Paper text:
Like other AB-type toxins, it is composed of a surface binding/translocation moiety, the protective antigen (PA, 83 kDa), and two cytotoxic subunits, lethal factor (LF, 90 kDa) and edema factor (EF, 93 kDa). While PA8 can bind up to four factors, only three of them can simultaneously bind to PA7. Both enzymatic substrates bind to the upper rim of the PA oligomer via their N-terminal domains in a competitive manner.
We determined three structures of the fully-loaded heptameric anthrax lethal toxin complex, which differ in the position and conformations of the bound LFs. Binding of LF to a single PA protomer is mediated via the N-terminal domain of LF, orienting its bulky C-terminal domain such that the adjacent PA protomer is not accessible for binding. In this way a single lethal factor de facto occupies two of the seven binding sites of PA7. This results in the two complexes PA7LF2+1A and PA7LF2+1B, that differ in the binding position of the third LF. In the other LFs (1LF, 3LF), this region is flexible and not interacting with the α-clamp.
Numbering used by the authors:
A (entry chain J): 217 to 301, 309 to 320, 332 to 338, 368 to 397, 405 to 428, 433 to 773
B (entry chain F), C (entry chain G): 173 to 274, 287 to 301, 323 to 734
Write the structure that this text describes.
Amino acid sequence: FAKAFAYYIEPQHRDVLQLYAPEAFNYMDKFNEQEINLSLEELKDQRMLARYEKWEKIKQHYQHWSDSLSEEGRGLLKKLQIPIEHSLSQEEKELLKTEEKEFLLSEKEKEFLKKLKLDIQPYDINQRLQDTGGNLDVRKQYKRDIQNIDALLHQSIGNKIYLYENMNINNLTATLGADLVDSTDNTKINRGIFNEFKKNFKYSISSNYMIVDINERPALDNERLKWRIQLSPDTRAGYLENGKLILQRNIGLEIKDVQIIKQSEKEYIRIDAKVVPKSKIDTKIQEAQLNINQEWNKALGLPKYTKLITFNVHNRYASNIVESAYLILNEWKNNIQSDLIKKVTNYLVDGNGRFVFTDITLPNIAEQYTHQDEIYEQVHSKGLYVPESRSILLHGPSKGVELRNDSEGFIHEFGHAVDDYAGYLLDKNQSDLVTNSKKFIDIFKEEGSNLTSYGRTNEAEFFAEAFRLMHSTDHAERLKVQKNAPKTFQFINDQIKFI
Amino acid sequence: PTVPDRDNDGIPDSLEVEGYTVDVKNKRTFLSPWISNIHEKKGLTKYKSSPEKWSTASDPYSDFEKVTGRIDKNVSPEARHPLVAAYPIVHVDMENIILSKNRTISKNTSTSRTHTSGFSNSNSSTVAIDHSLSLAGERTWAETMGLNTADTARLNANIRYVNTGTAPIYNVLPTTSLVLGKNQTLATIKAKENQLSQILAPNNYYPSKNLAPIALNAQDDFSSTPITMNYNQFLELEKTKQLRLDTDQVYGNIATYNFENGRVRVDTGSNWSEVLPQIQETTARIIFNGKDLNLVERRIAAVNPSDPLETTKPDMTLKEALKIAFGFNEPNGNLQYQGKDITEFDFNFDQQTSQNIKNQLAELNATNIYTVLDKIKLNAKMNILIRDKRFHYDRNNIAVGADESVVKEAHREVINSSTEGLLLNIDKDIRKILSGYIVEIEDTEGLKEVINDRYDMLNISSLRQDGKTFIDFKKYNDKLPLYISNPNYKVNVYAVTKENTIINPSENGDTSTNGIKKILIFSKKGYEI
Amino acid sequence: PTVPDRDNDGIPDSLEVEGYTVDVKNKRTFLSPWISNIHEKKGLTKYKSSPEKWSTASDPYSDFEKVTGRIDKNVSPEARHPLVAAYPIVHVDMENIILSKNRTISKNTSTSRTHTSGFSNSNSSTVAIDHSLSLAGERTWAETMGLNTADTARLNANIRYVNTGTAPIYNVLPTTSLVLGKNQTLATIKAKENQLSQILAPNNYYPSKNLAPIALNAQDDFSSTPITMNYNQFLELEKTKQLRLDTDQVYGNIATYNFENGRVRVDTGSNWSEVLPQIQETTARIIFNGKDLNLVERRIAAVNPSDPLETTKPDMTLKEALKIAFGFNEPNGNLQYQGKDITEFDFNFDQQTSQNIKNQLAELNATNIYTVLDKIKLNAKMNILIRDKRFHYDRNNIAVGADESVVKEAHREVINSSTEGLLLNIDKDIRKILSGYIVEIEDTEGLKEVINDRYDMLNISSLRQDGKTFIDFKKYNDKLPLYISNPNYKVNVYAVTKENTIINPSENGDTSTNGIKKILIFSKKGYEI
């Protein structure tokens, strides 16, 4: 390392260096360009006097407004920092006579629990703003409290101060978080999954109010992610008495680098981010959306102008999902019959459907609730084909409870959409899947439950699941259905024939 | 953000003072600072140069161009190093003469590049005519040509030009004057005009070996017999059989490198008769005969304390000079030229250098220069002559002899023997100090019969097309094989070194090889054949 | 934001090193990086070049201009490829002579460009004088011309110039000297002044085949008989019947391409006598006699390890070199020249080249060069000679003979036969190594009657205007048809190859074809005619 440093400084020798170790020159180039200020900040954080002095100085600025702060403000911040976790008296008690089960049938009684689940949720703000991306009576409280808390912090942050924040990997991707630590060594992380994480991780967005620590402190066991942020002078943030800050909502951050470092004999994950205007990155998002659409519009005969694709993802993990749409779409084509694609697309271009990729809950994403008959009838999951809206929903943030990867998750949803198209061709004025009901129910009796537990749910899920297995990229999965359901195979082969 | 480049020579300052080297990657050449460990495996030479001289050597080639190769691609390799002046060295080689009177003696001649002593920067050669009698009947030249006291003989010779330097001449061809004896100038060879349109690359001949050499007499009407020659001169020539060929340095124009398109065009502004003096006054001159016992001359730029600008040139130690001027290397740290260690050579110095050279060994407290060799600084204007110590030399530093013991050692490999001659395979160099052989037979009782008992009948050893020397007895015999009166009679063979040869009849015109100092070289009995 | 271009040759660096190609779209020409799939179907050649040479070949044409066509539209196609120097090669062809004394012997001559071995970059040719007796009574020239011991003959010949090189010469024409024997220089042909205002394009004659050849004797008053010749030469000539034509390298100026208006103007600054030396020291020289058994010379740029700048040029494998220089192609992956496989060819190497190439074959662990052809690196200064394996050759590397067995198949196609002669159709190439035919008749009892039983009477075969060879019996007969003493008598025909011919009467002046090695060709009984 030392040698490389020396060769880099000498101008006349600089060229020689870049010539024989190009990547190494690149490595040293990025270090001296914008990776040396980070060295100084991290070193000062070990000297107790320095950290204490830094903390004291920042406080001695914001003190004046803290005295000015109203009681209502403190009250809002209190219920914000700490979530707040006999009203029935009717039939619900007679009938009644994991976290929601502890706190608290296949008939009309399971609907009362869906409604109660919405009425029994804790009054919270940061998850709601992040979950929704920005009972009715509670909404009025939400609206007023959000408005009141919003009209508090007039103090923009406007030298560069660095802050620390520990976050649970399960908040970004709970599927990878289960295997991030080496099975044979819990202190090490497998580089193989790690390089994948970094692959398409270029920028990230925070939609809620981040509560961060001024000085780095030890993290919890499931928190191995130590975010640091280069603030902007205009960003409004709110200080707390316990050495924490509440950041403004709708903040944009650009990820410059992500690497593994070692501290106290255990490994952890560092993500370097810079505060940037969210509007500036959203402009980048629309261009990315246009590029994917324009490319795929010419692919399956689609009209060039039609969007057919909108990036609705809003979360801390948005950019890997965005880049992964290309991967998902490329797999979807390479894995499905060219003639099936043409057929389904004609059925969609004729209407006004869309492929909605989002990281917010389905009932609040874009239109799911607009096609629901009852508020309590809302459903949230990775996605499901909705005939009324003729739209495909793919929830990036969530992890499929069955599928092993995203390809399987999509193909599983691809079945429900396929059934709807078949129904459109057959009974024009009748339930798209009314013909498949009595046809699959019988098939589901003899051996329907034998397969995966997801398909055992109903004919629709079974049909959708069976289609995925029959068209899986792993011939083994396809073969399985042949030697395990020889009967089911022939009729299943016959609906996709219908052009 | 421009690196300081005072001499304006392409190369930046620091590199020039400290050391650099050019290396090619992928396919692009860039100039780089010397890395001790990473460049050596690649066999690149560590350069030095002057940050204040557009041409450290002062030759018409820039420091930069030389190492990169944008230069007349004809300059010999050894002259690419920045510290070796690249310039031409032309001397004249005369192949054979013929004589008659204004019965024609047409004899083949041999020439050698010369150097004599107070020796000055001017090239000269010396031809030596063979004395052996090719024809039986040609005793007394005065009669083979009907030359009378009041007659005049005509001389008709062939010459070729030799380039032993390191750079090409292009248009002009040098003027050269023949002179016999101390002051008898026989002729000056005219400078033919606009006729040497060919090229003289180093180690080449003009005209090449494949063509007839240039006939000296014009064959036109310029002079009826340009090479007249009075009687008295002919007498002088007969006693000495030596001529000399003096040539001046009026060479041609210079070939310069043009950056725009890489075309090499002869510039009419720069002319060699003005540049040579500069080189000649600011460099150390080393003459070496290691290769083939011929005088190879190289010039190295040395510092001169008295002149400011001149101190800019990198200090030059002798050992590296030999390394860089001729090709010596250190496989095991021991200086050698294809095996032969440095210790087998003499060092002779002109009177000036000697006082200076005695000083340097004193501040080092040493007596054997061969050890502390690597600590001797070279100054401007020294002249050094390095010749192999094993051979004897004449006044003109030409190889003329050697100690017999080496000579005998040189003969122990008899590839074949019969009654018609020997077919040896000897190292090509010895056969440059042997004029011929005298064969004799020794009776079991001490008699002595010399076959070729004439001063001019010793050149009996030819060389076969496989490099095998072949000695023919029937040559200066009676075209008859060799007879032996006794299988117990000894057969003696003697070799005669050049220095010990006779070129003219004695006082009383003795022609027998009696009073000739002969070295015994072979003696096998009649049955040992 | 500018693509780099160190050599200042239009093409950018990266493009030059990795591979490019010229293409035409609608009608505009653009440069493209080599695309593997889209270019091969278009029959485009994959070029490479030096990012550091204004002319990778080092000839006076830039890398860019060659491939782009902005170049003298006269350069032969094969020289359009960037790695083949396009330069002139002038040799002299003498068509026929006539002789007399200062009753005129007028003979037609045949010349061939020669090459012998230590062969150097200098052009020379070789004429061969017809030996057949046009006149019956013209036995012994010494008497046909009243030549006396004290007489002198006058020589007056006709010549034309042949350009076998690859680039045009424009104004000047080379001076050339006649020489008999080893050193008898008969004459040097003057350089006429300001008269060769015409052009010598490749494969052309000057003056063209449709005009009278340049008379050698001036016919003016400059010298009454410049080419005098004493008796003894004539004797030498009679015994040898061979002359030599040495030519020098003094060509003219160079034709350059002008960017402003596309005019090709003869620049008076650049002169070929300065470029060839560069070319001659940086290229590999290849001689091939494949086309018509004539010596074709081409030059390829090869690397020289010792020189940085020179390492810049793309590595050249022998196999590809031949591909681009002569027209070999790969129909079925087997190298061939219009059918003839590479295995029918010889490889000869100079001793220098041998060392390098023998090394090269060792690190590859191969013994047959014909296999590992694509793995031989070419270095600078190698000389390679590719000759047909089927023929016998003499000392001057001219095609002179072949194994007899091959010769017979060349005659197995009798298109017609009669009592007046044969009308054959033989491959045009064979008929330059056959001096003539011996016809003989065999009595039914084994006798042998040779019709033309004189050394100088074997030119009995002609060629018809349809390319059919025609043998005429009445020429050297008694102007009489062919008689046969027996319809059962065999008619024997013999062929005489050049190498085995006699050019002068023997010891006892034998004229019979007895001691001549004759090969039997066509034999047929009297009724099979």
